[PDB]
Structure formats: structure tokens, C-alpha cells
Structure 1
Amino acid sequence: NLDIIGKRIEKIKQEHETSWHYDQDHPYKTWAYHGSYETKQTASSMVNGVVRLLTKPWDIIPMVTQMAMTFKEKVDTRTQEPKEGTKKLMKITAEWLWKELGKKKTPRMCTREEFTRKVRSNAALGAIFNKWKSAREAVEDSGFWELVDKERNLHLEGKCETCVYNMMSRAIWYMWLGARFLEFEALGFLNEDHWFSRENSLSGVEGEGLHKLGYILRDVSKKEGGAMYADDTAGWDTRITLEDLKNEEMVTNHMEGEHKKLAEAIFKLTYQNKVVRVQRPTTVMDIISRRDQRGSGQVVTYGLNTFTNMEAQLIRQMEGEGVFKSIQHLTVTEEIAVKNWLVRVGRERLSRMAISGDDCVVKPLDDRFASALTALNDMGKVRKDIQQWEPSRGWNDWTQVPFCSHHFHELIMKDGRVLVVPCRNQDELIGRARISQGAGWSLRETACLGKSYAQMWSLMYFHRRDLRLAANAICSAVPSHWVPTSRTTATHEWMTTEDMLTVWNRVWIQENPWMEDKTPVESWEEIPYLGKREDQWCGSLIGLTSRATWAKNIQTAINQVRSLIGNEEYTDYMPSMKRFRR
């Protein structure tokens, strides 16, 4: 309690000495509350005019148009302590999992140099405004690094002064760039050195890319066993227990010297004890604390979610296979059985899973897994939209399994070769491409963001008639040499000025380990579409009068956008499609 968080609390007390008051009408039940102080401030979604002018039929589709318009009483809930048997299962599994992940890796600190480079090419590290304008400026000023230095030496002393969260089924905890640096220095290696790659972790998909995920699910489907299970957790980040945070901290057992000490401080002082500031309209700032739940940087959150999800799913697999009988208590001989299972078949059981943070697909040895719920429920990983003790429903076909907001189609090229392609409802794709975030977008910057969406569609969603046509239209409407951009940056092969046919050949043929025949594709007409009925099932407007008029008159839409942008060098990509090729 207050000995680890007090210093942080004390410091804030003073910067607002004119405003401090222990409010008696505070709305917190599960968060420990400390005090309040005076503020008065808040980021709505803006429309991308380039993409909207080239997607006119979707102007009358509410599922698209409603996306651009516009629970914190789930952050304020509590998880129960798991039973002794559960805690033992988790500790044995976590110990074994860090050793496996460590066999072909070496923990190490990330550098000021590495951090500086990340900030100087716009990765969302969730920082705040103050003393310097942007992150770009703070990193070049040596005063910052003295602030970082002061904190760094405070952490080696086992104490914290400035590592405080700012709150804003989503909840994002921004920190000041300094606290973010120290998190990255100690734990950045998990992402920077690919601990959750499929090669390293067997269950993981870190860095794999949307073009690989379907091939990975088809490889899991080839294993002998039961249905494919894809159970979503209800508010995963809020169900992370203090026992979870303690098993995650065991990565420090593989560290040495300074690194070990810096990493122990991040886990102890910032993850297993937290200090947060929250906007309350009644407008004040509330200084609240709690020991459990996930509140880390988004990138460390991804890696530790993947770890604890891999652990939870191996234990659910152990329950289905009868490795242990009850979660109340692991006997002496059950412990040795669990250890022996892990050593004997643990790596095989990891390969039966695809795990992306809180998102999983599991192909267990058989369907006993469906009704193996005691460990999963007692660890607090309660399933979404199903009653606590109702057996999971599994999927019989890998092409129907949801994963990372997609499903996957098997698509045969006219030349016999097999593509496994990513897909989702087309209203979701079009609605997202019509949205920008933040202020001060020039017309050129708005055009370059539209071009980023268009090139992603050409590479990932070429098989959707409407998206291949709209992607060609946007790329024809934006000057040929203008560089695609984003403001928060899977593997993004579409972020390039290289010709998209050359990039398609590299991704889907040359570098595709599931494609034996490396014969290059010479034109977009060799690249197939879904069946027309399947395209309609997944949200295509093919067949509607609105869509026919849009396609027939597309040059008029392209020319409207070219007229707004002005007298620039453009390329016509529409003749890459059979119907515009005369």
C-alpha cells in the first residue's frame, strides 16, 4: 500500500496545493481513492473526404455511415483470488513457459538510441503533452534524459516518483514519455526480439501478418483432434489477477545485473502497484490506485496478454485431458503429472493454438475441452456471451473460425495454385477507411491516408470485387508519387511507393512458404476473386443498381477528386481490370 505509491501521491498533492480535497461523493468502489484537484478539458472521429467521394454507394448504408458518428463500470469491478490448486497450476505452467520462450532468445535492455529512433518514425507509445510540445522534441533535449536519469536511479533504489497512469470495452492508460522509456528499456526486448513469433513461442503470431494468419489456422486444422475453439474473454485486461502479474514477473528470473533490477522495479512499482488520474465531469481529476488488472504500454500489454493467454489455454487443455481432477488442491503426484505433461507434450499442445494477446484459437486433442471450465473460470478468464457453465461451441471448419477480427477463405487461382486470404464484413472495411483521427490534416495528408487504405485493400482484400475497384479508383485519384501515411503504425507491406503488383508477387508468391511454385503473376487479371455469391455473403454490393452506376461512371468520381487536389501527375489504374481494359 501507501509506502510504494505515497511518493507519487505526495508529489501530485503539491502541484495542485490550491485544489486538494478528499471528496466524500467519490464514485469508486474497487479502486482505492486518495484525493481530487481542478482541471477543464476532454477527440472525435473525422471523415476522410478522398475515400468517401470514391465510395458513394456506401453514403446510404447505415452500417458504414454510423461508424463515423460520436464500459468504465467494468474497470470498477473486482476478481476473486483463485484456489490453491489453480495458483499451483499457473506457477508451474508459467515457470515452464518462460524457459521454453528463453531457449533460443537472450533478455537484454532496449536503448535510448532504439527509443529515439522509434519516436522519430511515429509508433504510438501512448505518451502525453507539460514542458516539451511533442515526443520528437523531448528526446533531443538532454534535460528530459536527466529527468529519466533521476527516475532510473529512484527505481534501482526500489522507489518511484513520476510513473503515474492517465485514463481515457476500451480503456487506454497514457504515461509521460519518461515512464514509457523506462518500461521500454526493461521489457521492450519481448517485442523488439520477437519472443512471441510463431517460430519462438509455437502458439504466437507476433509479426506474422494478415496474409499468414489464414495459412496458420489451416495448419492447426491439419492436426488430429476435436473442434476449433475460439472463445472470447469478457474484458480480458480487467480479469488480470495479481497472481497473473506475479507469474509474468518471473521473466526477471532469466535476467541479470542492472537489467534484472530495472525490470523488477517496472513489475513491482508500476504493474503490481498503480497510480492513475481520471477525468470526472462532476470537471476534477481523481487520483486512484489498485494492485491488479492490466495497465502497461500497449506493446508490453500485447506480449504479456499473449503469455498469460498461452498459459490459461494450456491449463484448459490439461483439464480436458484429465491431467488434474480438481482446482481446490493439486496433490504431490498431480504436480509431477502436470510437470511431466509439459515436458512430454507441452510444445505439441502449444502448436495446436494461435494466440494474439487476448484472442485465441485452440484445436485440442478432443472435445472434452468444450466442458473443461473450472480452471478457466477460477483464473477469472470468464467467456463472453455464454453462461458460466455452458459448454463451448466449437467450429468444424477452419474457414468459419473468427481470429483477429477476420475469417479466412481458400481461393484457387485459374492456374491451380492455392491462396488463403483474410476477409471481414465489407461494411467494416469501408467504414474504417472513411475515418481519420486528429486535427490539422492537409488535403495532401488526407489523400496519402486514403492511398494507405487503398494499397492495404489491393494486397489483403484484392478478392473483394468492390474493394479492388475502389482501391484502383483511389490510387488513380491520388498523385502517383505521393507516399502513403498513417499516424499510428501485423506487417504493413502496403506502406510503400513500389508498384502494388510487384508487392503482391513478393508477399503471395515469392516469400509465401505455403506456395511451392514461384512462377510470378504478370497482371492483376490472373489474381482471382471470391465466388460472386460468397462476395455478396461477406457484404459486396455487386448486383445493386447503386453499385453498377458507381462502377460504370468511376472515371467521373476519379476526375472529381483530381480536380480538388489540382494539376499533379496521376496514373490511370482502372485498365488493370478486364471491364475497363476497353
Structure 2
Amino acid sequence: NLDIIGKRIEKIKQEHETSWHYDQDHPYKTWAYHGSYETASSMVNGVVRLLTKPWDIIPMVTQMAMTEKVDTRTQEPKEGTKKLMKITAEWLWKELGKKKTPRMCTREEFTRKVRSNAALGAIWKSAREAVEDSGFWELVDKERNLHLEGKCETCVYNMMAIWYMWLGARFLEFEALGFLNEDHWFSRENSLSGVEGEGLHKLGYILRDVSKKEGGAMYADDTAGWDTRITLEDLKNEEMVTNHMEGEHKKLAEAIFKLTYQNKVVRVQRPTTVMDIISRRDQRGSGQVVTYGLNTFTNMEAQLIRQMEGEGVFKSIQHLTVTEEIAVKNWLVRVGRERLSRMAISGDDCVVKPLDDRFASALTALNDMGKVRKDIQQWEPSRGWNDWTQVPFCSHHFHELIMKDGRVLVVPCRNQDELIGRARISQGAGWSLRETACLGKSYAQMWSLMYFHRRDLRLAANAICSAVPSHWVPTSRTATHEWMTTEDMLTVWNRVWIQENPWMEDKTPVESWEEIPYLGKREDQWCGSLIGLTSRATWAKNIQTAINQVRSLIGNEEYTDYMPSMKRFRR
């Protein structure tokens, strides 16, 4: 407690000694309060909006640009649950770490991430200026030697829920735990259940492969506030990755887990305006990319235990018998890898095809681990899916699409209002017309490679690419990102969907976009197309006028028409 978190608080208290007041009317119940001291909207992308006029009247799209679960506690699991988790976590770190060696990530790797503008969750006005200043690295090394001493001084979170930190503390986490993402621990090759690095164009093929396994329904239960339901027992099972480490790495990693995760300190603004300095032991508080890997790990653990419950491996969560323990251990060594293969897990998001539908009502371990299901009553059996093309995963569903030549594409899809509404939004200040145009181009190229099968998005993508100068490079201030490039989109399409695609045996290239199919006209409408509306027909007819409006605003530049690629603009 105060041994570990004190110095961090005491250092903050000193710097605001003239304004340090113990607020007696503090709203916290489950967070520990310590003291208080005196102390960013969505912006519309104009290029994308001018080329999507029909959507200017559609509520869902328009309203996307307009505009307390942290203060809950999580009961400690029973003895049987805690034993199931410890055994499963032990086994899972071994299976993951069999083909992978834990290592420290380097200043040089970290600096490359800041120079390439990667999201680290920092709070020198820029990351670039800090990694170039040798002073900072002296601050880092001071904390570093404090961590080797088993102590902490400057690793405090800043809730604004994304918890930001000073770049230093971010480096110390990346140095100790970055290997999990940097070395692809949660790849489908190393993990069997994971999809890390897969890409949207892979995920449908993966869920079709899971479908092929004999068993029951596909389950895709969402957890009600996953990050808030991470227990101290969860954090202790995650910490066992240090059992596979040695030297400066093992001790440094041990310090991230014990000083920053298993104990924390946070600064949250309250408008009554005072900064509160609060602490707690449990719940997920770490960088997004580490949080992704540890969420995947604990989700993989939880779903193997739910599978064990459905299969009758153990009878009660109250207490595991020594005989139950060896059976659990034997199930893992015998069938564990096959069971991990029956799942697709992306952080808190899962799809599970269990051995049979007993899984649907195997709820005692899942509820006792704190992973309570969203939108369903505590003890009501899960609703399963009887077709892989209906299963929700990573905010998508997936269609099976037949090319005129008989080859099979499995494509990603979601309601089209969501896609158009997101592409119309840009975050942050000081965007030039050129910067705004290059972000619109990034969305257009993504639609050409991921959503080419939606009539409205292939047309709007061709319009935006025709309105932005051909040689201007697509941008994104903040999954694979193959659409990010200046190469021909047809060349990239052929690479992604034909050349690289392990599910496509015939490698015969496509030589025209008209060889690339759409969903059925009725299916397109079901997934939110405006085909059949008068607004959409006038937009399609008159698209060159919209393109020319945006060209006139950007000015005299090198422009390439990409509308002739489509049959209806081809003479």
C-alpha cells in the first residue's frame, strides 16, 4: 500500500503544497482517495462530407459527429475458481512461450515508434523532442534504478477510459512487456485462438475455419465492462509471464506488474475544479497495446475454463479436489491446443465453437471470475449462432461472395451508416486542407480493399480518389493497414485477396475492377445501402460535379479520374 504508492503521492503533494486539501465531500467509494489540489470534440472531414451528400439527411451518420463504471468493485473468486485460473494460466504461458523467448525492447525500438507517430498514450510538447533530449533518458534511468530497487516515483496514470502517462513510464512498460506485441505472442500461429496481426481481410476466413470444426453453435458473448472486471487474481496470473524471464528483464517486468498494475495511483479532474489523487489494486490500468495482449491472454484463459465447465471436467467452483486438479491438468495437455483452435479472441472480444451446446448454460466459473455477460440475465443460457456469416466479431460480420470465375472471397462488412459516419470525422486541431484531403483518401482506399462489395462505398471511394491529387500520400495521425500506400489500388487488391491469400488456390490475377463482385442488391440494402433512393441516384448521376467542387477548393493540381473503372461511367 503506502510503502509502494506513497512516494508518487508525496512527490505530487510537495509540488502542490500551497493547494493540498483533503476534500470530505469526495465521490469515491471503491477507489482510495488521498488528496486534492487546484487545477476535444469530433471535427467534420469536409472532403468526405462534400462527396457523401445523400448522407447529410441520415440521422445515424449526422449524429455521430455531434456531442461511471470505474467506481465499482469485483468480489474475490471462490477457491475452486482461483485454482482453475492458476493451473490454466501456468499452462497457457508455457504453450505461448514454447516457440518465443521473452526479451527487453530497446530505446532504439521505442524512438522508431515516436518518430513514426505511434499511439503510446503519453502526456517537450512532443514525444519526438523528449527522445532527442538526453536529459529525459536520465529521468528514465533514475526511475529504472528505482524499479530495480523495487520502488516507484513518477509512474502515475492520468484519467481523461484512456489512462495516459509521462513518456518515461510508457518506455519502462514497453521495455519490460513490449515483446508481447513486438514478437507477436498473440499471433494465430503461436496462440491458436489469437488473431493479432491478422487483418480484417483474414478474420472472415478464420471464423469460416472455426465453423468447419464439429461441435455446437458459435457463441460470441460480450462482457459488460471487461477492463473494470479484471480482478487482482487476474493480474497475478498475468504476472506469471515473469517466470519465463531472467536477469534485468525478470526484475524490471516484476516491477511493472507490482508497482504500476497490482498497485496504482491516478489523477482525475473533478469540476466542483480540483485534481483527485486516487489509488486501487485491481481493474486494467496499462498502455493500450499491452492491455490488448493481457486482455487476449485472460480472455483465452476464461474461455478454456468455460469450455472445461461445459465438458464436465470439474463439478463445482467451490473447491477443486486433488483428483479434479490432475483431470484439469490432463485435459489441458491432452486437448488444450484443439480447444484453443475452436476460438477467435481479440482482447475482450471472442467467438467460441465448443464441443457441444452444454457450454451455453456453463455459467458458474464465468460469473465467479467476474466476466459477467452484457445484455442477458446472469443465469439465462447464452444465445448461439447457427451460421458463421451471422456471428459478430471485431464490430463486423462476414459474407461469402462468389466471383464470376467461381473463386470464393470471404469479406468484412458492417452497417454502412457506421462506415460513412466514421470517415466524416477527423480528430484534433490545425488540419490543413491537404491533411484533411489525405485522411479522406485513407478511408477511400480502405473502402476499396475491405468494402469494395458495397455499391455506395466503391463509388464514394472512386469519387474521393478522383477529387484528391493522385500523388498526395494518405495520412492518419492515429490490424494491418495495406490501404496506406500510393500504389495502384487494383495492384494492392490482387496482392491481398489473390497472391497472399492462403484460402485462394488459383492465383490468376484480376485485370479490371468490373471482375470484382458486389453483394446481392437486396443484401447490400439490408447492410444499409441507399441503392433505390432518388437522393442516391442523383448523387451517382452527377458525381463529376461533386468531384469538380472539391477539385476547385483544393486548386490546380494533378488529378486522375477513377470513375471510368466502374461499368456505368465507362461510355
Counterpart for residue 550 of structure 2: 561
Q: State the distance in 2 between where 1:43 and 1:529 align.
A: 38
Counterpart for residue 201 of structure 1: 191
Name which of 66, 81, 103 aligns with 1:69. 66
Q: State the distance in 2 between where 1:123 and 1:402 align.
A: 28
Q: State the distance in 1 between where 2:295 and 2:135 align.
A: 34
Cα displacement (A) at 1:332: 0.4
Counterpart for residue 483 of structure 2: 494
Structure 2 counterpart SS, 1:398: coil
Structure 1 counterpart SS, 2:568: coil
Structure 1 counterpart SS, 2:276: strand
Counterpart for residue 449 of structure 2: 459
Structure 2 counterpart SS, 1:574: coil
Instruction: Give CA-to-partner distance per residue, 1:532-570, whole Å, 9 cap, x none.
Output: 000000000000000000000000000000000000000
Cα displacement (A) at 1:76: 0.2
Instruction: Give CA-to-partner distance per residue, 1:61-115, whole Å, 9 cap, x none.
Output: 0000000001xx2100000000000000000000000000001000000000000
1:415 aligns with 2:405: yes
Q: State the distance in 1 between where 2:489 and 2:18 align.
A: 59
Instruction: Give CA-to-partner distance per residue, 1:376-409, whole Å, 9 cap, x none.
Output: 0000000001000000000000000000000000
Instruction: Give CA-to-partner distance per residue, 1:157-205, whole Å, 9 cap, x none.
Output: 000000000001xx00000000000000000000000000000100000
Q: State the distance in 2 between where 1:105 and 1:476 align.
A: 46
Q: State the distance in 1 between where 2:539 and 2:335 align.
A: 56
Structure 2 counterpart SS, 1:68: coil
Counterpart for residue 384 of structure 2: 394
Cα displacement (A) at 1:124: 0.6
Instruction: Give CA-to-partner distance per residue, 1:323-355, whole Å, 9 cap, x none.
Output: 000000000000000000000000000000000
Structure 1 counterpart SS, 2:482: coil
Structure 1 residue ranges without an equivalent (≥5): none
Cα displacement (A) at 1:266: 0.1
Q: State the distance in 2 between where 1:133 and 1:430 align.
A: 33
Structure 2 counterpart SS, 1:37: strand
Counterpart for residue 424 of structure 1: 414
Q: State the distance in 2 between where 1:237 and 1:379 align.
A: 13
Q: State the distance in 2 between where 1:524 and 1:137 align.
A: 45
Q: State the distance in 2 between where 1:357 and 1:108 align.
A: 22
Counterpart for residue 28 of structure 2: 28
Cα displacement (A) at 1:283: 1.2
Instruction: Give CA-to-partner distance per residue, 1:130-166, whole Å, 9 cap, x none.
Output: xx11001000000000000000000000000000000
Q: State the distance in 2 between where 1:542 and 1:295 align.
A: 45
Instruction: Give CA-to-partner distance per residue, 1:495-548, whole Å, 9 cap, x none.
Output: 000000000000000000000000000000000000000000000000000000
Q: State the distance in 1 between where 2:328 and 2:191 align.
A: 19
Counterpart for residue 56 of structure 1: 53
1:150 aligns with 2:142: yes
Counterpart for residue 47 of structure 1: 44
* Runs of 4+ with >3 A deviation: none
Cα displacement (A) at 1:420: 0.1
Q: State the distance in 2 between where 1:145 and 1:16 align.
A: 25
Q: State the distance in 2 between where 1:9 and 1:490 align.
A: 38
Q: State the distance in 2 between where 1:14 and 1:47 align.
A: 43
1:162-561 paired onto structure 2 within 5 Å? 162-168=154-160, 171-487=161-477, 489-561=478-550
Q: State the distance in 2 between where 1:437 and 1:36 align.
A: 31
Instruction: Give CA-to-partner distance per residue, 1:31-67, whole Å, 9 cap, x none.
Output: 00000001xxx91000000000000000000000000
Q: State the distance in 2 between where 1:357 and 1:339 align.
A: 25
Q: State the distance in 2 between where 1:344 and 1:512 align.
A: 32
Cα displacement (A) at 1:467: 0.1
1:78 aligns with 2:62: no
Q: State the distance in 2 between where 1:535 and 1:501 align.
A: 22
Cα displacement (A) at 1:249: 0.2
Cα displacement (A) at 1:374: 0.1
Structure 1 counterpart SS, 2:564: helix
Cα displacement (A) at 1:284: 1.0
Structure 1 counterpart SS, 2:76: coil
Instruction: Give CA-to-partner distance per residue, 1:480-508, whole Å, 9 cap, x none.
Output: 00000001x41000000000000000000
Q: State the distance in 1 between where 2:404 and 2:518 align.
A: 10
Q: State the distance in 1 between where 2:191 and 2:106 align.
A: 24
Q: State the distance in 2 between where 1:58 and 1:11 align.
A: 52
Q: State the distance in 2 between where 1:52 and 1:299 align.
A: 32
Instruction: Give CA-to-partner distance per residue, 1:447-473, whole Å, 9 cap, x none.
Output: 000000000000000000000000000
Q: State the distance in 1 between where 2:413 and 2:14 align.
A: 53
Percent identity over the alignment is 100
Q: State the distance in 2 between where 1:387 and 1:315 align.
A: 20
Q: State the distance in 1 between where 2:129 and 2:304 align.
A: 45
Q: State the distance in 1 between where 2:240 and 2:8 align.
A: 26
Q: State the distance in 2 between where 1:126 and 1:142 align.
A: 21
Instruction: Give CA-to-partner distance per residue, 1:283-341, whole Å, 9 cap, x none.
Output: 11000000000010000000000000000000000000000000000000000000000
Aligned alpha-carbon RMSD (Å): 0.5
Cα displacement (A) at 1:243: 0.1
Q: State the distance in 2 between where 1:176 and 1:534 align.
A: 48
Q: TM-score, normalised by structure 1?
A: 0.98
Cα displacement (A) at 1:258: 0.4
Q: State the distance in 1 between where 2:271 and 2:563 align.
A: 52
Structure 2 counterpart SS, 1:35: strand
Q: State the distance in 2 between where 1:569 and 1:280 align.
A: 51
Q: State the distance in 2 between where 1:581 and 1:156 align.
A: 68
Structure 2 counterpart SS, 1:4: helix
Counterpart for residue 122 of structure 2: 127
Q: State the distance in 2 between where 1:274 and 1:347 align.
A: 35
Structure 2 counterpart SS, 1:217: helix
Q: State the distance in 2 between where 1:302 and 1:52 align.
A: 33
Q: State the distance in 1 between where 2:138 and 2:563 align.
A: 56
Q: State the distance in 1 between where 2:442 and 2:395 align.
A: 19
Q: State the distance in 2 between where 1:202 and 1:92 align.
A: 19
Structure 1 counterpart SS, 2:419: helix
Instruction: Give CA-to-partner distance per residue, 1:425-448, whole Å, 9 cap, x none.
Output: 000000000000000000000000
Structure 2 counterpart SS, 1:268: helix
